[PDB]
Ligand binder design. Structure first.
Ligand SMILES: Cc1ncc(COP(=O)(O)O)c(CN[C@@H](CCC(=O)O)C(=O)O)c1O
Ligand SMILES: Cc1ncc(COP(=O)(O)O)c(CN[C@@H](CCC(=O)O)C(=O)O)c1O
Lengths: 401, 401
């Protein structure tokens, strides 16, 4: 009877644990379609060209490794706000915001939840869409908040249940917290249409709710960064002061570098200053100061005109390839003789596809084909290459035949 | 009346905030002796040679930026345990441990506190020495634990109050948590003597306390890594299963890279496995997976025989320089005509000096001389160069005259 005799064997993560399982398989034809990580057309990890250059400029400069401020690299911080907000924005222009470097999307999301837990005096509930990224639950839960739900996806029709969302949202108690995915809803790949977003704006405004946006896919929904940030900006411009989390893990392929930011839209710059003081106080005893690498890379790209333009071309390239794989998938399915309607594959946007497969089908896929995906039927289309799209379709067909 | 009208202006960090203040000063002769960051003999940030090479090997390899496992880079993780434990250790050999990559010292410390908060069923109290690094308080406090204190430093005699510590420690209630600094006690720079550590071992064993070690200075106490890790290893070998946090920020000059690890000594490997599962579950919703850069660098150095040896020479070099500055300081003080006994300057070990200056003297120092240090009289001797040791002594003398 030692200290940890009672600690139990916890289970593996529903998403991250897939990669652990995929690693052990000996089948040469294995495919890792669990996590949303982009693969090039050869089915290989892709480090952006602009990233490589940025790295190079950093090396040549013979930079130090000194501790960054608690809030992160200023240059990175101001650049992220700008990327989210837009240069012409009154919020940005007026300096009514505070952005703080975060440990990617998760760390930012968590700093925010913890910030909310500590300063959001009007409520303890966070409303998540149905469904939502698995990780949103434990992030809010460990921070000290309560979880709720609003309707979002309708599996009968493979779309957004707008009537149900509006109903649910219009009943949420005033001053509660609502979580919205900025674009490329994970894992459904279905987003509200702009007119749809306009309507949601009204109700969130009308009910006086704190809108918390999760932006991990800026540039993967349409292949355009300004376009993908529309809703976010529309809310701010309607008078809604949101909070927001950003990730550069996908859009810059900075996965393991862990670069991201958490922002709060305030009333003035003086308010901004005070919010800032408290976020730092919260960050200090968590990890003290953030990791410099990803931040340095991102800043360099965001702040160097030629690198920035290069980056945008690269973002289109990535999105377009994804479209291409979706298209080929459906076509191979038809070719293989599948009867099912696979149109949702091509209707959905972002990195994934919310297929519909039942858990028995998923099991098979892994066992007979060594195709790894999450148990809910979500697959990573982004990790499909010209060379294995055929194997994929054949498997999907076999298991669905 | 917006969302954050009530949030108040918090104060700047007692340590980190010094650098913020130092940044704004226009005096050309300014010195930043607040944070413990090593400066070379020209008074410049120093990036180790081995670090540079490691970076180079990484570049040339054209490595990916894919997400690391939740627990960190295996190679880094096994290497850290080994560096802490020693290669011949039964704990290491038997695999009765679990090491997890952490966001430097602070992140590791915090993961551990949170782990404790959640699984340490025998108590909510953490006993800190008097005094202790300012940051230890809020780290435990935000995690959900209660803080206590044990006597340690005696300001009358500029040493370790052993009688007082033994008294206090022998009264701590069984099964409580005790925090010990492995070597180079921050901020006193006074450590127990080996025979002293042997005695403390007994009592911690006798009272059945969970010993939590904070090792951020392996190699700065004596200039020898195996020697600096003596106490830690002695406890383990006496049958004490400790928990431990490591930082590579000073000893590898990885400051902003944020590399570190948290380890738990278990009873068996099966226990290790279960503890592991739960740490991952705790890490997942905090930041998801750790930053790769510092980890990749550290692993490369730790695991490449020639780099490792190089690193050790570099560690001696750093420690020796520190000794040199201490020596010069005292000598300049004598030369300037100071009457006070400054022997503690040279008696103390690690990166700092616990000077004795009252807060009025510290104020002066900053105002008239632009010498920045923490309010408790702690200065960073490590950041002193041959060129400004004289200015320092003159100031200290003027303000103390
Ligand atoms: C909506 C959303 N927010 C935040 C994040 C976290 O991004 P980081 O910057 O890496 O923390 C993800 C990642 N979604 C993923 C990647 C795997 C995971 O972290 O669960 C996905 O759905 O596979 C996400 O989809
Ligand atoms: C005992 C101890 N533990 C943990 C840490 C944290 O190290 P990180 O890996 O950077 O998180 C420090 C840093 N001590 C410092 C550096 C400034 C600070 O973080 O307070 C010092 O005392 O100046 C420390 O002295």
């Amino acid at each position: 009877s030692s200290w940890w005799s009672h600690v139990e064997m916890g289970p593996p993560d529903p998403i991250l644990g897939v990669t652990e399982a995929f690693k052990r398989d000996t089948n040469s034809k294995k495919m890792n379609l669990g996590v949303g990580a982009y693969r090039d057309d050869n089915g290989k990890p892709y480090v952006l060209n602009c990233v490589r250059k940025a790295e190079a400029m950093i090396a040549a400069k013979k930079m130090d490794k000194e501790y960054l401020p608690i809030a992160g690299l200023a240059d990175f911080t101001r650049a992220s706000a700008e990327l989210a907000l837009g240069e012409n924005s009154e919020a940005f222009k007026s300096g009514r915001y505070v952005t703080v470097q975060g440990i990617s999307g998760t760390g930012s999301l968590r700093v925010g939840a913890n910030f909310l837990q500590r300063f959001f005096k009007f409520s303890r509930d966070v409303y998540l869409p149905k469904p939502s990224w698995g990780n949103h639950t434990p992030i809010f839960r460990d921070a000290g908040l309560q979880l709720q739900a609003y309707r979002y996806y309708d599996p009968k029709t493979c779309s957004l249940d707008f009537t149900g969302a509006m109903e649910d949202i219009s009943k949420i108690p005033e001053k509660s917290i609502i979580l919205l995915h900025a674009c490329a809803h994970n894992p459904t790949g279905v987003d509200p249409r702009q007119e749809q977003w306009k309507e949601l704006a009204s109700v969130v405004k009308k009910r006086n709710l704190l809108a918390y946006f999760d932006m991990a896919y800026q540039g993967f929904a349409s292949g355009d960064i300004n376009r993908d940030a529309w809703a976010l900006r529309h809310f701010i411009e309607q008078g809604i002061d949101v909070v927001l989390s950003q990730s550069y893990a996908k859009n810059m392929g900075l996965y393991g570098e862990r670069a991201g930011a958490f922002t709060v839209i305030c009333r003035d710059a003086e308010e901004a200053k005070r919010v800032e003081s408290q976020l730092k106080i919260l960050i200090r005893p968590m990890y003290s100061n953030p990791p410099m690498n990803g931040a340095r890379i991102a800043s360099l790209i965001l702040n160097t005109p030629e690198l920035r333009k290069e980056w945008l071309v690269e973002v289109k390239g990535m999105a377009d390839r994804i479209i291409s794989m979706r298209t080929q998938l459906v076509s191979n399915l038809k070719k293989e003789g599948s009867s099912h309607n696979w149109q949702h594959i091509t209707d959905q946007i972002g990195m994934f596809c919310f297929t519909g497969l039942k858990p028995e089908q998923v099991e098979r896929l892994t066992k007979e084909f060594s195709i790894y995906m999450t148990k809910d039927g979500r697959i990573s289309v982004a990790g499909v290459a010209s060379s294995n799209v055929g194997y994929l379709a054949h498997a999907i067909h076999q298991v669905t035949k």
